[PDB]
Design a protein around this ligand. Structure first.
Ligand SMILES: [Zn+2]
Ligand SMILES: [Zn+2]
Ligand SMILES: [Zn+2]
Lengths: 97, 84, 171, 162, 533, 279, 112
RNA sequence: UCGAGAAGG
DNA sequence: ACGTCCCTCTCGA
């Protein structure tokens, strides 16, 4: 069943944040991507049942992060990349404000 | 890294969202074999156990209320007022 | 060398631990990971200092997961070698290409090329050793070596040294 | 999860982490912590005696085995490094006593030479200043060969009866 | 099991930094160079080809692991390759801003047309904004068609043309008309001063203007361009990429062995186009490329109403959901909904095996997936699923704590109930479950108007949680009794209606009387009757 | 369009109403900081009516023989007639009640008195009489300075924004003004004894209940007023334009409405029915 | 002054069918349009041009268009918006996500 | 698995 | 350059 935009808004008005995440991550999509600490995009090779992480190009085997995001977003970021756009995912902030 | 426990502006009363997440978190935790500090009166449901912990105010949780600028005001469950 | 660094690390606890020896198992799990651990950045993190006055800070409860993460702060004894420092050590290995030297937690290897010309080798020795004009490098002798280069191998930073330059070798 | 912090040759050109100005754990520009073999062996020992006292709340090359049983109590045997380290330290330490070590630190830390040089000078026994400035390259002009040998000779008397 | 475990430290994204790819970074992260426009067509046999599709990209077959990260389909994210273009090529969404930069920089020296001396420009460069600064410079630079020598120095001082585009490329006129090739503007952009392009509206490392012209194109992995089994059948974007390489590998042999001016300038605007329609296939002029049919460009993949953002990320098709015809019930309580037996035996909630429900759960597990108070799966702490519907050990299975029992939803469970209009937060409330027969959602009579729902063929959505946190989320925030007083109109949104409303008037009259026998039946019908006559 | 433009907005932990940028839209949500569900259309008896009936209902003059409280309306009645040090507080009360009447006639210029306000006072004094069984023949046990001082001390505790500096205190003073003008209107000294017939315990219970129900009616920081406000006009517009009754010509101008909702939102300088109302 | 006439017009069309809506919702939308300096339209150009995050602005009308100017002008997303966490499968800073829950080890020993 | 049509609140 | 919301079915390369 579709939990569409119309239904999303009612949970926002209700303030049911933890549920809205569950209804949109445990009920569909969800993925375990490995992103580079340098460039925030999904280049890391995840040889995990051998324990070897690396990101050729910006060679590093130490600054890698696991993130939980919808596979439709992983698809979307990969789609923007094929259009030459870098949507770098950073696990920390800098703007403050 | 900025706030003092004597300079407190946010309301001393616990919001409906604070109670709802504290209850769910404790209930989720009790469901995961977490130690129950309240005296258990024969309950099979962790939500009721979490409500009993809230009634006797025996939850070790503490809310960090993030203000728009980046400040955060720490309020223990123990010290928050539950009217609602 | 040998250094004392103000490190930090984040551990995640399952909700079943939330009660008594909470502060203790965090301290225990901090040692279980960082003790005897080697990183390419800081080298051999050997000993966590001052177990008593160890900070714990508050623990953030995860979103849909019940676990909690703690930023633990600590001070430790570390050992990262460098290309150019002279270190003394005890010989361990002895092969046709050279000999390894136990300098602390780390093994440094010297090549037969990285030894002076008067240094010969005796494989038919019990134990096998490197003879010379007046000195002999036995299988367990004490030697002063200059680290020529270092390489970071997962969780064991190894090195290559020399005794060909002056003021190196004998003890 | 791996180790975090707050922020390469022996020619004072050390790592980015291992530079002179580095942040305190509270947050102040403090000098880097370099410690010679004797300065090290003692610091690990006193921190392991601290640990044995906390778990309770619930002469000659023969200290090798008394430290070996302490390491079997305080820390797990899953740490061959700290075992190999303490064996190496006690076998290569120039000063065994806390008083002699501190007196060494008094002499060394007045010259104002780089901490790594301070550590490497308390670890390696040198006679000629030509021998000293050659094994630790970073000196050369930092200390007078007479003044350096003045320290070397002062340090040679301060050596523990090993 | 789902997805395996990786030692990598988990975090959450906190900053999404948008930039541009440098054709060096594309070449650096790419596995191998895509050179053959073939799929599995080594000999159309078992393997793929070391040219396109899994030449170190990512597995195509179900029972085969990835050539790089040998992890296989589920958990393997797919890794990028690349195509080195024979000649630089404009970008579709940047073709406008590429023009707008040339209207500001020197077409000979690369400096700004008006630097840091002209009054209105210095009011403009002081605007420390973003594209609002870029707008002020572009208007105050497009007019001047020359540079300067000093005026009380700044270089050169050559003449600038009147540049306006032609669907695919740019032309400028001096006074003599000349077409501005891609390679030409590429050199102009790379010579733009480090201070100039940054103050224009770009970035020194994330978005350099020279990266709006593509020198190396990133080949996306098979997941975004999959292969269907109808003995196969590729995706439209796989077809389009073969067309790009076909136009590319020609222009390479044209410019090497041959040297005709018209032929090399011919296949270049073709490659300029195939890279263009690959991203957007809805351009100003342009034939809107068709392949034996149109073609779905990547912009159409991301376009609103559906397309990832609006239809896959802001709204998702979701598990643990139900929908059936609704009927009305006067004997049901307000804050509960009638769920058919069929739906309860299909929908599940995973209860962690804890010393409280262990006896209740073992009873349910050994009941079965077809008996009402039962369970469908039981998930061990070892992370594997035990299908109680088929497993040989299903009859016994001794339970352990820390396990999960995917048990049928039973009475007085929090669910989400929803009418399709969905306009007020009162159109989505939490109900108690009361498992009932017949195939309808039977809800209470007075919670009619908040949903705006009758029973003339109406259909309603039901969602069920899966965590104990989001059960509290529904029961403590979204429950029906809480919503009784609406904030939208500071008045209550539910009330007595129809038969209950017509009868309450016919009853509350002075003309109305009831005798002893029927009075007693009315009193017992009140649940909270004090037992006092 | 609405929902997508307002979702960001919510009530933050300092009662400011901000988007994702942190830009302030409202300094107190609803210009009073109150949740919408806890609000009911109350009546401000002080604005409407003749000035002559106003004195009959609120004025208490201890320095009089006809316009004083009869010692049958309360215990300290004959020992209070002519009390100079107390009549100064009676004047202070009646001077604030007259300030209210002029102040309300500034805001609601048309003379409307029924407006939505938190806490139903008329129901509280109703339940007080129903609970403590007040006898309208025996006199009250309240002093004159029990009522007026208890009401003044009640307003000090009716809090919306907690703060330190005068910026917050003076804006908090604004956030309550209306409800205080009603509180003064319903807890005038004459009213409390002459027609409410209250006792000391019953009147304390009323003050305690007013303080509590008010503190509940406050918004909860985290309320998603952004999408909530968008939804609040969304469902009506989905209705609306329920066509009935005919009249063209002016066609009652913008009786638009559903295309004016269009017109208003995208502004659009070309208006469909502009009209200057010259007074 | 224009703010009040804006509310007056939208109150007239809602109260054209009796209906009634509490002042706060309409004054919210009115202030939202107002608090900018002038009148900002509620369309793809009027409020969507704001300096907010790219990921929440593309989810309105102009989708791929904004994401292209984002890579060109090198934007950075705060993630403090609603629709960002939604796209990212993250618990939003909405209601129950407007705070964080911690545990006090002192309280853990306090309550035995 | 994409495009065209009919139908329910 | 936008041009409501979800549902159920059946037809074509
Ligand atoms: Zn990287
Ligand atoms: Zn792979
Ligand atoms: Zn020029």
């Amino acid at each position: 069943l579709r939990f569409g935009e119309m239904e999303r808004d009612c949970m926002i008005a209700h303030g049911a944040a933890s549920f809205l995440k569950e209804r949109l991550m445990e009920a569909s999509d969800a993925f375990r991507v490995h992103i580079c600490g340098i460039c925030g995009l999904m280049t890391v090779i995840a040889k995990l049942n051998h324990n070897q992480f690396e990101c050729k190009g910006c060679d590093n085997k130490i600054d890698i992060y696991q993130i939980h995001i919808p596979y439709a977003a992983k698809l979307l970021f990969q789609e923007l990349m094929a259009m030459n756009i870098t949507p770098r995912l950073y696990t920390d902030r800098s703007r403050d404000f | 890294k900025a706030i003092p426990k004597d300079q407190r502006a946010t309301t001393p009363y616990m919001t409906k969202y604070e109670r709802a997440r504290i209850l769910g978190t404790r209930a989720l935790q009790i469901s995961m074999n977490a130690p129950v500090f309240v005296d258990l009166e024969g309950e099979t449901d962790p939500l009721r156990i979490a409500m009993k912990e809230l009634a006797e105010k025996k939850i070790p949780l503490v809310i960090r209320r993030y203000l728009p600028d980046g400040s955060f005001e720490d309020w223990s469950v123990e010290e928050l007022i539950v009217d609602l | 060398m040998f250094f004392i660094k103000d490190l930090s690390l984040n551990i995640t606890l399952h909700p079943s631990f939330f009660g008594p020896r909470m502060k203790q198992y965090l301290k225990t799990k901090l040692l279980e990971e960082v003790e005897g651990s080697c990183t390419g950045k800081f080298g051999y993190i050997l000993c966590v200092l001052d177990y008593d006055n160890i900070d714990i800070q508050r623990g953030r409860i995860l979103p849909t997961d019940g676990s909690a993460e703690f930023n633990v702060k600590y001070r430790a004894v570390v050992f990262k070698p460098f290309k150019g420092e002279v270190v003394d050590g005890t010989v361990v290995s002895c092969s046709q290409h050279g000999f390894e030297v136990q300098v602390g937690p780390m093994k440094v290897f010297v090549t037969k090329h990285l030894m002076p010309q008067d240094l010969t080798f005796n494989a038919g020795s019990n134990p096998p050793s490197y003879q010379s004009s007046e000195d002999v490098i036995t299988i367990k002798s004490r030697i002063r070596v200059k680290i020529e280069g270092c390489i970071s191998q997962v969780s064991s930073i190894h090195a290559i040294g020399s005794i060909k330059e002056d003021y190196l070798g004998a003890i | 999860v791996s180790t975090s912090t707050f922020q390469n040759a022996a020619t004072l050109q050390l790592g980015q982490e291992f530079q002179l100005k580095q942040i305190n754990h509270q947050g102040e520009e403090e000098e880097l912590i370099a410690l010679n073999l004797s300065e090290a062996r003692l610091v690990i020992k006193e921190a392991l005696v601290e640990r044995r006292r906390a778990f309770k709340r619930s002469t000659r090359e023969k200290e090798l085995e008394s430290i070996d049983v302490l390491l079997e109590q305080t820390t797990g045997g899953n740490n061959k490094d700290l075992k190999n380290t303490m064996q190496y330290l006690t076998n290569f330490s120039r000063f065994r006593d806390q008083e002699t070590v501190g007196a060494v630190i008094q002499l060394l830390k007045s010259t104002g030479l780089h901490p790594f040089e301070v550590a490497q000078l308390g670890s390696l026994a040198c006679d000629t200043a030509d021998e000293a400035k050659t094994l630790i390259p970073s000196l050369n002009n930092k200390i007078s060969d007479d003044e350096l040998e003045r320290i070397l000779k002062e340090l040679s008397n301060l050596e523990t009866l090993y | 099991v789902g997805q395996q475990y990786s030692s990598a430290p988990l975090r959450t994204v906190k900053e999404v930094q948008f930039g541009l790819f440098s054709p060096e970074e594309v070449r650096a992260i790419s596995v191998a160079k895509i050179r053959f426009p073939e799929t599995m067509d080594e000999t159309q046999t078992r393997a793929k080809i070391g040219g396109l599709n899994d030449p170190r990209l990512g597995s195509i077959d179900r029972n085969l692991k990835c050539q790089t990260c040998q992890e296989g389909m589920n958990e393997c994210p797919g890794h990028f390759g690349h195509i080195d273009l024979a000649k630089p090529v404009f970008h579709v969404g940047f073709i406008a801003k590429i023009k707008k930069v040339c209207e500001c920089v020197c077409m000979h020296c690369g400096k700004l047309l008006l630097d840091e001396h002209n009054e209105l420009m210095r009011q403009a460069l002081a605007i420390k904004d973003s594209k609002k600064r870029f707008a002020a410079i572009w208007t105050l630079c497009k007019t001047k068609m020359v540079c300067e020598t000093d005026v009380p120095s700044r270089g050169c001082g050559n003449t600038q043309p009147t540049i306006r585009k032609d669907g695919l490329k740019l032309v400028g006129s001096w006074k003599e008309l000349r077409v501005l090739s891609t390679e030409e503007i590429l050199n102009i952009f790379k010579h733009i001063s480090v201070k100039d392009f940054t103050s224009l509206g770009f970035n020194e490392v994330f978005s350099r203007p020279e990266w709006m012209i593509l020198t190396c194109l990133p080949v996306p992995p098979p997941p975004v361009r999959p292969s269907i089994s109808f003995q196969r059948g590729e995706d439209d974007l796989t077809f389009k990429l073969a067309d790009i390489l076909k136009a590319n590998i020609s222009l390479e042999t044209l410019e090497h062995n041959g040297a005709p001016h018209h032929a090399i300038e011919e296949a270049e605007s073709l490659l300029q186009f195939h890279v263009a329609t690959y991203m957007d296939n809805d351009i100003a002029g342009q034939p809107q490329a068709l392949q034996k049919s149109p073609v779905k460009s990547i912009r159409a993949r991301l376009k609103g109403k559906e397309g990832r953002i609006r239809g896959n990320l802001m709204g998702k098709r979701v598990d643990f959901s139900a929908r059936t015809v609704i009927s009305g019930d006067p004997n049901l309580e307000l804050d509960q909904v009638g769920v058919p037996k069929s739906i309860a035996k299909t929908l599940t909630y995973p209860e962690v095996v804890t010393p409280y429900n262990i006896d209740r759960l073992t009873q349910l597990v050994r009941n079965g997936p077809n008996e009402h108070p039962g369970a469908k799966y039981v998930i061990r702490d070892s992370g594997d699923r035990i299908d109680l519907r088929y497993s040989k050990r299903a009859g016994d299975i001794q339970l352990q704590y820390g396990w999960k029992v995917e048990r049928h939803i039973m009475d007085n469970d929090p669910v989400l109930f929803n009418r399709q209009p969905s306009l007020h937060k009162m159109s989505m409330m939490a109900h108690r479950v009361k498992v009932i027969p017949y195939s309808t959602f039977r809800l209470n009579l007075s919670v009619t108007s908040p949903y705006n729902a009758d029973f003339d063929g109406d259909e309603m959505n039901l969602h069920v949680p899966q965590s104990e946190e989001t059960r509290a989320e529904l029961s403590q925030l979204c429950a029906v009794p809480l919503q009784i007083v609406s904030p939208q109109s500071n008045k209550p949104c539910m009330g007595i209606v129809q038969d209950t409303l017509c009868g309450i008037r016919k009853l509350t009259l002075r003309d109305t009387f009831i005798e002893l026998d029927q009075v007693l039946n009315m009193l017992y019908w009140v649940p909270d009757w004090d037992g006092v006559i | 369009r609405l929902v997508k433009a307002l979702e960001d907005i919510m009530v933050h932990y300092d009662n400011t109403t901000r988007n994702s940028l942190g830009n302030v839209i409202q300094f107190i949500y609803g210009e009073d900081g109150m949740d919408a569900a806890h609000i009911e259309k109350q009546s401000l008896d002080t604005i409407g009516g003749s000035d002559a009936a106003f004195e009959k209902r609120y004025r208490v003059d201890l320095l009089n023989t006809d316009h004083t409280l009869d010692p049958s309306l309360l215990e300290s009645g004959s020992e209070i007639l002519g009390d100079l040090k107390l009549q100064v507080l009676l004047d202070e009360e009646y001077k604030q009640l007259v300030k209210d009447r002029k102040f309300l006639r500034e805001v609601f210029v048309d003379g409307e008195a029924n407006w939505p306000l938190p806490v139903n006072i008329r129901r509280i004094i109703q339940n007080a009489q129903q609970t403590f069984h007040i006898d309208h023949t025996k006199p009250s046990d309240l002093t004159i300075k029990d009522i007026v001082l208890g009401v003044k001390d009640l307003q000090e505790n009716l809090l919306v924004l907690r703060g330190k500096n005068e910026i917050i205190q003076n804006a908090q003073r604004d956030a309550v003004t209306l409800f205080c003008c009603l509180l003064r209107s319903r807890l005038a000294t004459r009213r409390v004894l002459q027609e409410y017939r209250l006792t000391k315990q019953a009147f304390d219970w009323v003050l305690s209940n007013i303080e509590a129900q008010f503190l509940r009616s406050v918004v909860h920081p985290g309320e998603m007023v952004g999408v909530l406000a968008a939804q609040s006009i969304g469902e009506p517009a989905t209705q609306m334009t329920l066509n009935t009754f005919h009249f063209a010509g002016v066609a009652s101008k913008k009786v638009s409405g559903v295309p004016r909702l269009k017109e208003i939102l995208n502004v659009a300088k070309n208006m469909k029915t502009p009209s200057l109302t010259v007074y | 002054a224009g703010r009040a006439a804006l509310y007056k017009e939208v109150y007239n069309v809602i109260a054209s069918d009796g209906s009634y809506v509490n002042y706060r919702h309409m004054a919210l939308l009115v202030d939202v349009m107002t608090t900018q300096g002038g009148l900002t339209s509620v369309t793809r150009h009027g409020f969507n041009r704001s300096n907010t995050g790219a990921l929440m602005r593309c989810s309105f009308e102009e989708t791929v268009e904004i994401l292209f100017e984002a890579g060109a002008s090198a934007e950075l997303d705060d993630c403090r918006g609603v629709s960002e966490n939604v796209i990212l499968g993250q618990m939003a800073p909405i209601g129950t996500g407007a705070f964080d829950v911690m545990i006090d080890e002192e309280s853990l020993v306090k309550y035995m």
